[PDB]
Amino acid sequence: PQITLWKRPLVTIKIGGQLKEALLDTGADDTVIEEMSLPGRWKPKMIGGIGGFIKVRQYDQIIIEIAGHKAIGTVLVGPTPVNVIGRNLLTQIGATLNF
Amino acid sequence: PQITLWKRPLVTIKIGGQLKEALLDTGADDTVIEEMSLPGRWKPKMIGGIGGFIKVRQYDQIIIEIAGHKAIGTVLVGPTPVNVIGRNLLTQIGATLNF
Numbered sequence A, B: 001p002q003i004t005l006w007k008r009p010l011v012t013i014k015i016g017g018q019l020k021e022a023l024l025d026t027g028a029d030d031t032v033i034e035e036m037s038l039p040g041r042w043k044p045k046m047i048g049g050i051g052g053f054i055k056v057r058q059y060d061q062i063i064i065e066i067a068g069h070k071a072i073g074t075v076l077v078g079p080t081p082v083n084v085i086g087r088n089l090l091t092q093i094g095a096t097l098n099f
């Protein structure tokens, strides 16, 4: 699709057997999801944005379906105010910015 | 152009006759730039990012060039860790997300 930016570019994702809404976010290096359980090992991480840093759990090799497109990569889980699909997964679905 | 996301989507902007680097950020509603001087009056705004809320100075109707495209709109000035071009100006330059 071509998504305009008049409104937030929100899509449905499937992660860990759950449906969630998330923002397609070119300014996010990493994918950050609100608190949920995921399988496998994790390690702690701090990530920073406007407002400062939050502590997250880093899970690797997680499969996510984004607007119908499957991708695998690292997912950070923690107290983000919005679920964000970052560049690590946007690349895998072939997303580009065009103007 | 068509910008892939393997690296941060950094572009050169020009504001107040000065060149700066900024991130094309589809996850930002608003454009937020580091401390600098802008003309006219400002109004208060609070914005919420991953680590919490910050106060910024809102300047309206500011002339800004983004990757060679001219925009005129609202710029927020405050302690952002990177300059971000948000949807308010991405729409003015005709940007879309495509996959």
Ligand SMILES: CC(C)CN(C[C@@H](O)[C@H](Cc1ccccc1)NC(=O)O[C@H]1CO[C@H]2OCC[C@H]21)S(=O)(=O)c1ccc2c(c1)OCO2
Binding pocket: A025, A026, A027, A028, A029, A030, A031, A032, A047, A048, A049, A050, A081, A082, A084, A086, B023, B025, B026, B027, B028, B029, B030, B031, B032, B047, B048, B049, B050, B051, B082, B084, B086
């Ligand atoms: C600020 C940029 C450099 C980074 N952020 C991504 C943004 O797209 C963020 C994504 C975001 C969106 C909403 C709430 C929190 C974060 N947007 C944001 O802060 O926008 C602010 C400016 O406009 C306003 O509209 C949205 C909030 C305000 S982020 O959320 O802090 C972030 C995401 C993934 C990351 C990361 C930081 O570090 C490593 O991986």
Ligand SMILES: [Cl-]
Binding pocket: A072, A073, A074, A088, A089
């Ligand atoms: Cl990854």
Ligand SMILES: [Cl-]
Binding pocket: A094, B004
């Ligand atoms: Cl590619």
Ligand code: NA
Binding pocket: A039, A040, A041, A059, A060, A061, A062
């Ligand atoms: Na894993």
